[PDB]
Amino acid sequence: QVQLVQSGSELKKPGASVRISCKASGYSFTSLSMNWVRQAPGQGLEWMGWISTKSGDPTYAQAFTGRFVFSLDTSVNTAYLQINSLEAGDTAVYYCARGQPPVGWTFDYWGQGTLVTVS
């Protein structure tokens, strides 16, 4: 069974950094893309970009260029999202979402989400 397990809730001050993890089980982590989606409280889903688990190359959405870093540790089947220079507007739930084969523009499995609260 396919599953994405994310790390716990975070509470940070403005200017700090935060690293969120998304551990994949139930398939070959390196066979499918990993995408990142933000949802500010009460708002809709926003696509942050994706990371190729084939090569490690990250591709950021226009709105998420600069302070956001997608990375991988394939040896523990884990994708990471780090947010730098945290600001109040970053308070949100962040999801990882697997790209459904063959082209990965459908997200068939989603992590449970990680709340980040910036005080």
Binding site: G44, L45, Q62, Q100, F107, D108, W110
Partner: protein
């Protein structure tokens, strides 16, 4: 202000059918068949319900269906049940090799 336009809310009584629309442009919804629908109970992860306009993942009942006409996709939920009450989001591939979401529709079951 999202790229795809959805009605903010929709309502129905149990057993009825409700349709939620998702209007994009020829650059996304109309230009490709990679339109998806996700069901989100608030505070839980989105769940894939429809992909590639009309395909259902295994385990999703046949009450959920999807279609498209021009630049507008549609998700239909027939035989409405109380557990269908949730937020529904559409998404689409774009000609810029990105994915865009709709603003979401709150579906209430009376």
């Amino acid at each position: 202000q999202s790229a795809l336009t959805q009605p903010p809310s929709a309502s129905g009584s149990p057993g009825q059918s409700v349709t939620i629309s998702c209007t994009g442009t020829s650059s996304d919804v109309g230009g490709y068949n990679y339109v998806s629908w996700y069901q989100q109970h608030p505070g839980k992860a989105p769940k894939l319900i429809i992909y590639e306009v009309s395909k259902r993942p295994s385990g999703v009942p046949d009450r959920f269906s999807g279609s498209k006409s021009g630049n507008t996709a549609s998700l239909t939920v027939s035989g409405l049940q109380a557990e269908d009450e949730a937020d529904y989001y559409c998404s689409s591939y774009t000609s810029s090799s990105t994915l865009v979401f709709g603003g979401g529709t709150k579906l209430t079951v009376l």
